[PDB]
């Protein structure tokens, strides 16, 4: 998503449904490459602590003035006719200047945005339709004409453009929780295993205290911990170096 060769243009924004994986947002937030990292659901630091049902990654190119509009509750041709976030957007907007990557020397014209629409689009809609626009009362029975403008016009991206008319890539991480089990979790920190010493142990959620020792027990390929007559834990299997 972040290192793709060619992004979608804003009218036709790509979505990737990130799920069944561990999401190391520390790689993202520590990156010197980003201009903007606006998180609306939670504070950016805590993203490695959370877990979600899915993380939709919406990707598109817009102008460096328009990146601001991607924030929730914004008014403007990108926020209204191309890509709209809901008032309770529980996610992050991430953006970077890609002028040296998306500005052909004589100008690039591959990226289109909708300048015109009969109504603002609803949150997370996408409108691929090229249907000629009804800008004038006269019905647009033609393929082109006065007041029959093509809704999709194209950006002006040139290397010598100002910050504002240089292309910004954007990705919006829409994180969601549903009634389904959360599968997009963060990377769980794992500090060194120490032995013959009284220590606080957290083995896959199992908070406890005790002296850890190398066991002579032999569990089954499926077992991960053990208990005693009292239904109290007395043995656990190391999740990284299986012992």
């Amino acid at each position, epitope marked *: 998503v972040f290192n793709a060769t060619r992004f979608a243009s804003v009218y036709a924004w790509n979505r990737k449904r990130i799920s069944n994986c561990v999401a190391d947002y520390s790689v993202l937030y520590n990156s010197a490459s980003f201009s903007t990292f606006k998180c609306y659901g939670v504070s950016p630091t805590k993203l490695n602590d959370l877990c979600f049902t899915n993380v939709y990654a919406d990707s598109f190119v817009i102008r460096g003035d328009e990146v601001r509009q991607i924030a929730p509750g914004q008014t403007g041709k990108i926020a209204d006719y191309n890509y709209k976030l809901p008032d309770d957007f529980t996610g992050c907007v991430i953006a970077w200047n890609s002028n040296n990557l998306d500005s052909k020397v004589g100008g690039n014209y591959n990226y289109l945005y909708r300048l015109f629409r009969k109504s603002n689009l609803k949150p997370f809609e996408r409108d691929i339709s090229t249907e000629i626009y*009804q*800008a*004038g*009362s*006269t019905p647009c029975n033609g393929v082109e004409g*006065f007041n029959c*403008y093509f809704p999709l016009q194209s950006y002006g991206f040139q290397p010598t453009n100002g910050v504002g008319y240089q292309p910004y890539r954007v990705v919006v991480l829409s994180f969601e929780l549903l009634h389904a089990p959360a599968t997009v979790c963060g990377p769980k920190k794992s500090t060194n295993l120490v032995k013959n010493k009284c220590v606080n142990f957290n083995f896959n959620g199992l908070t406890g205290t005790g002296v850890l020792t190398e066991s002579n027990k032999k569990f089954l390929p499926f077992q991960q911990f053990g208990r005693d007559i009292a239904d109290t834990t007395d043995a656990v299997r190391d999740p990284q170096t299986l012992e």
Partner: antibody
Amino acid sequence: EVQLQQSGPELVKPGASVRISCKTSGYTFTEYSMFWVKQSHGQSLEWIGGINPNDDSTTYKQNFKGKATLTVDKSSSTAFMELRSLTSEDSAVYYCTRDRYDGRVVDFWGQGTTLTVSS
Amino acid sequence: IQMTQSPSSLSASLGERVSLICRASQEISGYLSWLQQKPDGTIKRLIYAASTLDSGVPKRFSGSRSGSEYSLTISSPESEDFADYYCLQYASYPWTFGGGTKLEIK
């Protein structure tokens, strides 16, 4: 108030041009198209053409395209019609109008403008 | 490409029914508007989109599509409504109008 402050009654001797304004108000000027009409003292009204004040694009009746020229100025928020080489064909009550797709089509009209070309 | 208004002038008492017609030689797909002109220069829209009206204007106007014909019909005359009437055909460029019809006292 969708008013239309146009130019008052006007005269010039033939073989000469003219200047005709239509100021518009009560709306954001680039949200609507502008068109024009020529109504003679005796003969019917006809459509001269229009300008979209947003996109600076234009369209005309083929008959008038060769003698009309429509313009706007955004900072003045005003429409402006020029007549080039006026003669015995070029005299009427001229009228400005406003248009859109969502129901506001040719509803309100400038008080017109006397463009007599007689001596 | 213009449609034709049946009569050039029409005369009435107050109260009498008044029908105004703008026939069509080609299909305008129902894109048409009715306009009111006073002999002293006052222009204002009556009807659009065939049947849509009732906007800052006397409630009596009606203009439902009559097949091959486009229409205006009124539930009374009035002092100001003794005036000129015009149909606008905008379905296509170039725009055109009917020749107009004048409504008068007897």
